[PDB]
Amino acid sequence: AFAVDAAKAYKDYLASGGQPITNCVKMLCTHTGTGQAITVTPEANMDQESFGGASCCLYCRCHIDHPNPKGFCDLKGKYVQIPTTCANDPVGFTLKNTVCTVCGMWKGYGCSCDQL
Amino acid sequence: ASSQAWQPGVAMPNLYKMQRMLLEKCDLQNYGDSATLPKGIMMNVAKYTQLCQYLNTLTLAVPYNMRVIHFGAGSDKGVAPGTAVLRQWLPTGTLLVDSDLNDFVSDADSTLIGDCATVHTANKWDLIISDMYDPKTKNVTKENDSKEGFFTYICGFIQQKLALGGSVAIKITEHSWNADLYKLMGHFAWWTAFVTNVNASSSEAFLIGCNYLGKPREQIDGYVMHANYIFWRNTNPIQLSSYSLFDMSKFPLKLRGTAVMSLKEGQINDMILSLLSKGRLIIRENNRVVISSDVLVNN
Ligand SMILES: C[S@@+](CC[C@H](N)C(=O)[O-])C[C@H]1O[C@@H](n2cnc3c(N)ncnc32)[C@H](O)[C@@H]1O
Ligand SMILES: OC[C@@]1(O)OC[C@@H](O)[C@@H](O)[C@@H]1O
Ligand SMILES: OC[C@@]1(O)OC[C@@H](O)[C@@H](O)[C@@H]1O
Ligand SMILES: O=S([O-])[O-]
Ligand SMILES: [Zn+2]
Ligand SMILES: [Zn+2]
């Protein structure tokens, strides 16, 4: 029944004033992309930064199992778009946020499916 | 200011390759200076971006399911900035394998950890990138001789596992170089030593072999060519520049769907060598890509 909860441990660490995980790999790009959350190539819009996926994954970075059967990673080999205002902590942003399964945008940072 | 400042970097001019200089110490006028990188961009993202921007100007063969292997992909950061740039640059569907002596997290399709000499592959490759380097090779208190170590492996890997028509980009410095690797540059349709504009204050260069012919088209003396390289660097200050990093609109390598054929050595005629030399052909089996790292068992 025991299972290390790295996600909760990092969130609690940030709450205690801990410095965010560094060396997330920021990519050079046009900043004229679709703005979707996780893409095959950098898709940052003017309000985002694109990062190499593996470098923004808590599980990849901490060398721990991915939390799901088969231990698949949704970020490795892809690019994650992070709002520029949250680009100081890409790992924390990916852990605390959810991707819309319909438009592929971050809920609260691009997804407009809930609008009239 | 300099016209070269708007390019991704500077390639060794042809007349410098034709000299017979003696090896001198590398003394860069701009040594110690650092280029101003775009905010939050790592030096190695900038460096690989400029290398890829330059490779875009060459006749690289780019087949479907292109096979790319990247040596020295790790870093003291535990991540692979160069692999992230190669993954961005290469066409979707390209198989990308990377490797390093030390553990690291990667965006490559597969990563092998261990000395490069332990890396074996059943398949041939279309592009080999190496950033392998040991800063301890820089010793100004002893003669600057041709280095073995990982260079011995890279020379054998090119001769045994690079597809005809394939290309290479191998990082060298004043002290991290190999005479046999320069000699092998003569086995390509074209070659150069490329200096990124962001790292122009370093003796670093990428030795680029473009379109492998599997035989010598020109005889190169490696000790003389490294001396020629240092002479060029010593007499041609390169202005540090990040300018090319701001326009990524034409960055992606275009998928050319270059033909892949499995021809025997007896079928490689002058017409085939011409197609290879123009980046219009890749010669290798198109079987499954299988890789492995040898593990020494002891106690
Ligand atoms: C300049 S660092 C590479 C930086 C990396 N390319 C990046 O994108 O940041 C050079 C790398 O070469 C690796 N290396 C040196 N000698 C090696 C060898 N014999 N086999 C494998 N890797 C080696 C080192 O472990 C080191 O990670
Ligand atoms: O991980 C976030 C980040 O901002 O931390 C500081 C540096 O390591 C940056 O390269 C990195 O993107
Ligand atoms: O473009 C001209 C050329 O000489 O320089 C670039 C290399 O790709 C060579 O193959 C090519 O023939
Ligand atoms: O040289 S032009 O690109 O400014
Ligand atoms: Zn992961
Ligand atoms: Zn949505």
Curated annotation (Swiss-Prot), chain B:
Reaction catalysed by this enzyme: a 5'-end (N(7)-methyl 5'-triphosphoguanosine)-ribonucleoside in mRNA + S-adenosyl-L-methionine = a 5'-end (N(7)-methyl 5'-triphosphoguanosine)-(2'-O-methyl-ribonucleoside) in mRNA + S-adenosyl-L-homocysteine + H(+)
Active site: K47, D131, K171, E204
Record's subcellular location: Host nucleus; Host cytoplasm
Annotated Nidovirus-type SAM-dependent 2'-O-MTase domain residues: 3-297
Positions of LRR repeats: 20-44
Function: Methyltransferase that mediates mRNA cap 2'-O-ribose methylation to the 5'-cap structure of viral mRNAs. N7-methyl guanosine cap is a prerequisite for binding of nsp16. Therefore, it plays an essential role in cap methylation of viral mRNAs, which is essential to evade the immune system, especially when restricted by human IFIT1 and IFIT3. May disrupt host mRNA splicing in nucleus by interacting with pre-mRNA Recognition Domains of the U1 and U2 snRNAs.
Subunit structure: Interacts with nsp10.
Protein name: 2'-O-methyltransferase nsp16
